[PDB]
């Protein structure tokens, strides 16, 4: 920005005006716009090279919003940390960005990328005989890490519970840790002979995600985000079948565990003898050398109260050195104590599967040092238009509250008005009319209701069943 | 709307003034082009013959199908008193105005014109470098001051006064600021030709005692002139009028010779796109436009967040929409702007959407919606939110001795259309403050 006259409307844009730069002669072909301040990337999906940029932008920049025409990504420190791991350097990123960018990359952006892209690949966390060793292929790193207040080819032991602390300290310090598992050369862990039967099929986006995960050839650790119903179960089964090592799956439900196991057996050639389900009903474990243990966070994170059989199961889990952990619905791992299982349970590889990588509190960022960065994400409308998923006509019904109840709404406190505006008659009448119309249309209807009292009242009024926590399996 | 507006203003003028207005061929050549094609055909037929033709002969020319067009043509021609109907010998003979006839004859046959079109100095200047830049800059300054964006060189007191005295650009000294109105947004939505015509028409109405005929002589002669050439300097009123017109960016003066500009020719007749934009389901706007005028007008109903050389990106928010609505802008006008500045990608996707809709159900021809219906619904819902509370000023009538009297007064109010609410059980009703006096007088009588 030198000798550039501001426009009369420049005042409206507070340090956001980007007219101080000029456009390249090949703007008609280059589809990318880069924000020098906020890091937001505007992608033209209707211009040449759009497909070539759609995956690279997903890799290096998180998606903010991806509507039909114009896509919106954003570059952040975590995104760059995820990108720098998979054989990507600032030189290559800048080369591609310049070749695809209508505008030249600013020195500030270059500095920001350089600061964070040159601090990776000097520490590796390994496990040997149920002992966690922080092995570093270089020794000079000691002169700063061992001299730092928190820390403390050379390898030193570290407390299993202190993993959650050391990983966050590594994030704060220049070098973060990477968890790579060379299952090809890993012979100590007994192998499990399970493969995907011919009936299995892998969708194009599933194959793309697996390619982004195994491009180098060594299995990394991280998180996979796919829309609900995209095939996360099949993705996990494929990962387990290709790794061929002892694996434990944690799911936040019992019906989910049942179907997890059912799909597991259906999709792969897993023998029933090698399969074990760890729930409240039956706690038996496979007696084979290698198998899979499917349990729940409640059955893995509890430490005070355990049954006799469940205590033997927990002792088995702790004594054996697991090889892979699959966390379904990982958005709950950063909870007060569920994060403790990551540090306590021993495993060389951690995979998380979740359709949403956001949560109300700020602990979402802790996932970076808890399990690793995000690997792949998939759009919704793209799959909807490609036929992989369904199209929805989402609607919001405005039910006017009647005066009799509204007059009480005004006076009632915060706690009572909640039930008051949820049990208004207009909602009942609209629900009845919609039920009749859609039943004549022959649609299968689900009515969700968090409030148990409202659910019961609606069910008893309409003569239809209700299901909630008290309902037995 | 161009020809309609000019014709309406010319129709409102008195016949005595029109007769003097038709003296100069320059004005006649401009007025002639505005009439409908059938009227122009009849005028050309009548100009070259020095005789009177009955109206029935003219009716014979039009076919049965164009019989409707014949009525509009004759009505429009008679409204301006261009054709003088003389009835004698039992026949409604039709004749042309002698002054208009002579003016057209002189213009077409190169007869004496009294230099109505002006002369040529044969000293040409660079139109692209100077004329185009000057007019573009000055029109941009006036439009920038209209849209309200800050600008250093504020417009002159002449145009500022015209703006204030016109409905355009409502201003209040108590507030100490100027704001755009509904007519202002419509003016900004209109094309360049209509944008110039609106201001010129407002000037025509504003001027008082500078002859009305002289103003039209100058404007139509300016439309006659061609850009990129010199014209030596005319009426005494036209001198100051020329200086004033220089304030609108139509004619350029060195500081003895005046030069018409591109807008001068734009006045006579008409003549990826800049301004086309993409609207996303996330209430985001990406306009592939590089122009401060477009940016400022978008800022009226868009909460701008950043900008690039090639495009402008913003977000629609309740605050910005409420600002635009409070300025008097209608959601219909906003959607009209978005639709007429829709991107080719949006238009193609909407065409595919309409094709899919018709393919699924070709029996019903659904309307073509370029942008998602959710945005339209949200904007109209916000307008409804602004319109939620309804209040009127007036008085309440009660304590009626007799139901007959109560019904009589309420029925009278309803008949005169000043009744807003009534209740027979309570024998009460409310009337507007405007009709309060009439209702009171009727009650007394």
């Amino acid at each position: 920005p030198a000798d550039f006259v501001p426009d009369s409307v420049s005042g409206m844009f507070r340090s956001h005006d980007f007219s101080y730069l000029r456009l390249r002669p090949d703007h008609a072909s280059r589809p990318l716009w880069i924000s020098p301040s906020d890091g937001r990337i505007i992608l033209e999906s209707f211009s040449p090279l759009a497909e070539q940029a759609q995956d690279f932008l997903v890799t290096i920049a998180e998606p903010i919003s991806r509507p039909s025409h114009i896509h919106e990504y954003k570059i952040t420190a975590y995104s760059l940390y995820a990108a720098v791991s998979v054989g990507l350097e600032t030189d290559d990123i800048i080369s591609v960005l310049d070749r695809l960018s209508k505008v030249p990359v600013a020195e500030s952006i270059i500095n920001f990328i350089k600061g964070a892209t040159i601090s990776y690949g000097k520490v590796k966390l390994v496990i040997k005989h149920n002992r966690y060793f922080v092995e570093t292929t270089q020794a000079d790193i000691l002169q700063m890490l061992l001299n730092d207040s928190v820390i403390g080819v050379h390898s030193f032991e570290i407390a299993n519970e202190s993993v959650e602390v050391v990983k966050k300290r590594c994030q704060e310090i220049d070098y973060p840790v990477l968890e790579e598992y060379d299952f090809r050369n890993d012979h100590r862990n007994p192998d499990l002979d399970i493969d995907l039967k011919p009936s299995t099929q892998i969708r194009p986006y599933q194959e793309k995600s697996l390619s982004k995960m195994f491009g180098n050839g060594r299995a990394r650790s991280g998180i996979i985000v796919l829309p609900c119903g995209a095939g996360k179960t099949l993705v996990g089964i494929t990962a387990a079948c290709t790794i061929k090592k002892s694996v434990i799956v944690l799911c936040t439900s019992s019906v989910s565990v049942m179907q997890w196991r059912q799909q597991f057996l259906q999709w792969c050639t897993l023998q029933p003898e090698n399969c074990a389900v760890f729930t409240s009903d039956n706690k038996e474990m496979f007696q084979t050398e290698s198998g899979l243990v499917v349990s729940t966070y409640s059955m893995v994170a509890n430490t005070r109260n355990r049954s006799h059989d469940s205590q033997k199961v927990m002792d088995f889990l702790t004594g054996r050195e697991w090889g892979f952990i699959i966390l379904d619905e990982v958005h709950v791992v950063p909870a007060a104590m569920f994060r403790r299982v990551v540090s306590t349970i021993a495993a060389h590889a951690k995979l998380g599967l979740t359709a949403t990588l956001v949560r109300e509190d700020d602990k979402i960022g802790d996932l970076n040092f808890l399990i690793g960065p995000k690997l792949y994400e998939a759009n919704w409308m793209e799959l909807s238009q490609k036929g992989h998923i369904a199209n929805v006509q989402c609607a919001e019904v405005w039910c006017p509250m009647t005066a009799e109840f509204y007059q009480e709404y005004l006076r009632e406190t915060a706690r009572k008005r909640m039930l008051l505006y949820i049990m208004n008659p207009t909602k009942f009448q609209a629900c009845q009319f919609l039920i009749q119309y859609h039943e004549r249309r022959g649609d299968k209807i689900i009515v969700f209701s968090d409030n148990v009292y409202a659910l019961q009242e609606y069910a008893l009024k309409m003569g239809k069943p209700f299901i909630y926590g008290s309902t037995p399996q | 709307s161009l020809k309609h507006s000019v014709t309406q203003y010319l129709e409102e003028i008195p016949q005595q003034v029109q007769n003097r207005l038709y003296t100069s061929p320059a004005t006649c050549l401009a007025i002639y082009r505005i009439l409908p094609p059938l009227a122009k055909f009849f005028i050309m037929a009548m100009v070259f013959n020095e005789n009177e033709v009955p109206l029935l002969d003219l009716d014979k020319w039009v076919n049965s199908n164009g019989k409707l067009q014949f009525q509009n043509a004759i009505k429009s021609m008679k409204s301006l008193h261009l054709l003088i109907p003389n009835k004698s010998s039992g026949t409604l003979m039709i004749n042309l105005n002698p002054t208009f006839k002579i003016s057209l004859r002189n213009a077409l046959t190169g007869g004496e014109v009294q230099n109505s079109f002006g002369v040529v100095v044969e000293e040409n200047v660079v139109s692209l470098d100077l004329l185009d830049e000057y007019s573009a800059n000055k029109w941009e300054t006036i439009l920038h001051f209209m849209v309200g964006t800050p600008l250093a060189k504020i417009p002159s007191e002449k145009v500022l006064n015209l703006l204030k005295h016109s409905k355009l650009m409502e201003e209040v000294n108590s507030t100490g600021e100027f704001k755009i109105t509904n007519e202002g947004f419509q003016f900004l939505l209109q094309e360049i030709n209509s944008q110039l015509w609106t201001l010129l028409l407002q000037y025509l109405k504003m001027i008082e005692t500078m002859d009305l005929v002289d103003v039209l002589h100058f404007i139509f002669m300016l439309g006659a002139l061609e850009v990129g050439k010199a014209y030596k300097i005319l009426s005494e009123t036209q001198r100051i009028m020329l200086q004033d017109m220089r304030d609108y960016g139509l004619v350029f003066q060195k500081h003895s010779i005046f030069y018409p500009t591109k807008l001068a020719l734009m006045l006579t007749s008409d003549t990826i796109p800049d301004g086309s934009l993409i609207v996303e389901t996330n209430f985001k706007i990406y306009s592939y436009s590089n122009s401060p005028l477009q940016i400022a007008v978008l800022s009226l109903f868009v909460h701008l967040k950043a900008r690039f050389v090639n495009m402008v990106l913003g977000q629609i928010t309740r605050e910005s929409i409420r600002r635009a609505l409070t300025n008097g802008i209608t959601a219909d006008q906003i959607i009209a702007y978005l639709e007429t500045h829709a991107h080719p990608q949006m238009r193609r996707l909407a065409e595919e959407k309409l094709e899919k809709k018709l393919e699924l159900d070709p029996n019903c021809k659904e309307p073509l919606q370029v942008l998602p219906p959710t945005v339209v619904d949200q904007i109209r819902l916000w307008q409804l939110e602004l319109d939620r509370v309804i209040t009127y000023e007036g008085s309440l009538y009660s304590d009626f001795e007799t139901s007959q009297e109560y019904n009589l007064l309420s029925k009278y109010a309803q008949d005169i259309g000043v009744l807003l609410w009534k209740d027979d059980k309570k024998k009460k009703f409310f009337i507007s403050k405007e009709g309060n006096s009439q209702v009171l007088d009727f009650a007394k009588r």
Binding site: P400, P425, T426, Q429, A430, F433 | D377, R380, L381
Partner: peptide
């Protein structure tokens, strides 16, 4: 788009 309709109810 049913915005101008009267609100639903009894």
């Amino acid at each position: 788009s049913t915005i101008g309709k009267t609100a639903l109810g009894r």
